[model samples]
Target: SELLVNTKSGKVMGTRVPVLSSHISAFLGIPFAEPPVGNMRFRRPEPKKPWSGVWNASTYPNNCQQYVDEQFPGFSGSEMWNPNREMSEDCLYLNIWVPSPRPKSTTVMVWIYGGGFYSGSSTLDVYNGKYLAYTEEVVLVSLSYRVGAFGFLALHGSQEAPGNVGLLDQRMALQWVHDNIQFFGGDPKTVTIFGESAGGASVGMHILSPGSRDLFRRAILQSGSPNCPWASVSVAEGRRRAVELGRNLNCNLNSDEELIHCLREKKPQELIDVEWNVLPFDSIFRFSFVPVIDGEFFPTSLESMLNSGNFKKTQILLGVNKDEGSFFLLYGAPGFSKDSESKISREDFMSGVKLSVPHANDLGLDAVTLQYTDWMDDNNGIKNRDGLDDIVGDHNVICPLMHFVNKYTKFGNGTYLYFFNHRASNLVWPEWMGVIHGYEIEFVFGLPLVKELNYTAEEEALSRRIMHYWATFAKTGNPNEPHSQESKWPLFTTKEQKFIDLNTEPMKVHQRLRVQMCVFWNQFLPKLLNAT
Candidate 1:
């Protein structure tokens, strides 16, 4: 059974697939902006031309141009991210999942995946969004945008580039949601922008970008934050690195015009595959092709923008895992130990601090590092490959989230913070590292890609309960309801910013967990690079 579905502009024909039953709404892949190709690479997104007739959103468009298999050799997840899903420099398409023939004022949940901003698709297997639509009665959506050189490279000469094409893509996607979601049972009045990893940071970016103010009403930043050491960087530095990369690629950079011409002319694969391997596996290198503080789409530091209360009034639920850094150990970083002779050298640590927190002075960096190291010692303790990843996780993950929380609290209204201690049995690590990064995904999606991770019957039940809670949050703003055992999460307040501690022990709200971290990040706050 198939039918034609039309947009405000025109009608599109759609074929109904068997098995979904009575789900008669149409699916369309709307191109929200001009294809970012050729000279448009790295430039801000431009308005898409109106389609002449019915455009089909029937299937997922291709993902952004990403590093192929070699870039993600070991991980099964990475293999899934291979550009074959759909790869095009002009890949800016999003899908809508609706339940009934017509929507009943359904809220919209726009998902952004996290691959350090280099690779991800709205169509990733785990993000099927079917469960979300069936359960939440909400229209769930996902989008694919440019990544790597096509999306985020800084060509030294063009003031136009390193322009954060990724963020602009997201903004344009939101515009599509605002314009089109109403037809598919979505309420334009209620749009939520949510993402996981780099997507989480993108959520924070949404909070800070003036261009995004009116696009969304709420946000969910899961397991990632704006202040993540990796997400912060300068366009000047990105351009400097681009110059270096261009020279290696035989790009002629004697002048800005020549540099842009040469770099743009290079093949996308070569540009993406070439690792600026100077700081191998360091957070900086891991995010080499990520969003930069380019003047156009990303005009200013998210920190200052939030601190100055420059964001549109929106609700936010920002959170991170307890052991964010455990992946470093499994991924082959040089293991560190308490008794190890050449521990994280003072110089290496300082260099990392300077790179991540360039806005702050050395004194501020020293204070932040000491505070973070101390917490690592308290929670999981330091390591020799044993717990080294936990140290990296905190330094890179949890601390930065707290830094953002501290800055956000300085402003006002509806900021919720949480520390996910709920441990997953499938952690790549040897023993249980409570609430490791990406552990919350299964629960959030209401599906268990790895059922064995939570072997116990009770653990399985917990996953279900947690999924409902998350879906409930997406449907409505609050993360808890009567069905969920999670204690009612209070809106974060200055006096007692309540944190939902989701662990095996028992899910409850603790008052000081957020403030405790805020105290630590305040002392070690990174320097903010504000372009004049």
Candidate 2:
């Protein structure tokens, strides 16, 4: 039988599906914001208008328009994103799964998918919410926001084309959930936002944004942070890229309004067809377009926000995989090339280092290479891909996350950090690669795919523990107490820098988490980059 929930928008009918033992109500394709088309393109999303009668939310909606590209080899949009869903600019739908035997006040976990701010959709199979909702006893919500140029093209200013509409799209979804989740047996005040990659950075951005303070009580950032070099674009750079995109689309570049008008008349695919401007070095961290420091949503740069303590003080759980850069290293390309090459050589890796830190001279580059070198067999003519992977991972993902956690925990907020070192038994990659980025998604959600992957009993048990931890955090702002069988996950502190080692066999606490590498990045790299 279908369940009818009367929301602020109107009556919505959701389907009931059997879970492990009970059933869960699934409401798919519920619009929280109006269709961002025509005049709405590149503008902040407007609230969805109320519908008169019961609206069917049984089917998934169209995904935001995005083009399939080869920059990320194994993780392209066509490979792991919304494969069968229709693409349209009218895509502002959200999905919700609530336990059938509704509890009085259940926690809500909102997911924001990540694709370097250019690709990704909530409709992907990996983002399924059944298992998590059933086992964890929480309301799971996944949302589709505008991506690529349509979502992030910052033009003249906030007046003409403000940036970060994708984030605003997410904000609208959270507002919808806050206003309507209680009707589905969720607590309005206990919302926890979680995401990976660019989505993780989005979570961090929400924490920093004044507009998102009352929206979510907790956040989980996986393999990303706003402090990461690729997470933000300067307004000047954003306008430059917007103009470049405008020219590519054959639009008038004389003024922002004219450019926006011309772009509005073009088809959605026409915008995705002309990808954003490419970075000098072709690497995984090269995000040509992303959220910019608009005067309103962002107010200022992320680093500036962090330093000024201008963000909300919320409980946070954040981490990165051990080898987050392995995905990038394996898909390395030459300068300005979009095509992925077979392997990354030492020369190519150094070139990337130079490109990432443009002002760093030979001395600084050599110091970085030295910090990551494998001295045991380095001179024996063997390719040190492992070393390069470590460097890339540290500079782009791990270090930034550590810096963020370190800074925030210093303010006495309840911050938990984890080192996701577990590799699934079904992983097809080389064992030496360690835990790659995005591997934690399946385990975190406890997806049934784990069974098909031939996971060990230990891995399955670990997945259960992860789900419990995430759910408990959403419920209590602490992952240790409510239902987890695992040991107490310690709060991160500046003194100890303790972190939970999310691994198989035994989950333990560790004090040494890339300490030395982070020290270099925090203490030395920035100085070297900004040298006179």
Candidate 3:
């Protein structure tokens, strides 16, 4: 069936596409915001002006200008993750997948892609919404926002570069959905915002942001949180980076106004190229061009914002992969090379500790090493690479997620958590990597249910369960049902802290994920930092 949905801006022509046994209306590259190019570079996204005729949203949108990483051997996921479309600064487009023969009063889901605030697009095959929309009978929306230096340049409250445009871009897309999703047969009141990695952090940020509190009623975060150390930087640091970037590009460094003018005059790739300024060790836990705590987009840090009682109360579902940091090791390892993937000794592990926090006093380093070292294993031994991977996971993803739950649960929303333990048979990274970060996304998006992959019985069954659980939550704010059943996902609370494990065969619930690790990072590590 030909679908022409009348958006607030204009009518958009959506293509009829077949997914599995059913077909869905896929509207790709629908303009929600004006092209952020030329004079608009490094600024908050503006709403798209109303158009005259029906705009063809048939093809995938342009990916925001970003530096695509070179593919490495043994990592097949990279090529799958890179931008398949052209890259341009005018990349602020959103895609929607609406179920065919439509489900009435539909639950709308908006996806924000995760690329560490420097990359990622809605057009990636890994994140295609057709399978999820068709399987769950929900309208799926994915957003494309600015990234890298172009999206995050903070210039001391300068108008042309007000900072956190990346986040502001998301706010605009969300507003578009709320004001216009009804025309696509969606219920704006039942919108659920979900994402993974940096996308997950973006979800958490939206929850805390005062501006976005009223836009969505449900949230899902996959292995990310605003509490993560690297998620947002200080505004002072953001401004410093802006000036440093100008120095690198030989642009006007005299004033914020001149800097913005000269930098905007340069090509987009030039900005993306200069955004990659990272120290060798910084690569482990850092990225340049991350979101900053702007007074408007973000008045303060996520913790402070939540504590000040300025946030939304919504049902939240969040989780982490079993071996999240193993993927980090592939790119950010300092003690050992990820390409080699060989056994390292205790000495090598200590060196990794040094790389992660070189300023640590000797005893702090001792405490860090002691956290992961196994005393009972073969005369006080540790699996060197595995232990390092564990520390990175605890520091980078898991601990921050645990911290956010602790803070956000104070609002008493019905929160749910999951431990994604199944490895994607789809992931082609080395087998020893063991369910690396982002491995669980395939199942959540119902990629196995799509025609592209020949998934195993285990993956297919698990995908069905995961998709239903997510879609059900969007409808009623409970993954179990309008009521609860055997797949009964217990509501996570301060006391029980229950969460479901998405492993193959039988799904199970557990308590206190990384309990000891959480205590160390959320409690003790702060004391260590204070001591330093």
Give each model a TM-score: 0.83, 0.93, 0.95
Candidate with the greatest TM-score versus the true structure: 3
Q: Mind giving the per-residue lDDT tens digits that candidate 1 earns over 471-524?
A: 666667776685655457777777776787665566677776545555454452
Q: Pick the candidate with the highest lDDT.
A: 3
Residue-level lDDT of model 2, residues 320-362, one tens digit each, is 8988976665555232222322344566656656654544668
Residue-pair clash count for candidate 1: 16
For 298-374, candidate 3 gives per-residue lDDT tens digits of: 76767786676567887888999988887666665554544455465777677777666544678888889888787
Clashing pairs in 2: none
Clash totals for all candidate models: 16, 0, 0
Provide the clash count, candidate 2: 0
Winner on TM-score between 1 and 2 is 2
Candidate 2 residue spans exceeding 4 A from truth? 69-78, 278-283, 334-345, 355-363, 379-383, 430-432, 448-450, 482-486
Clashing pairs in 3: none
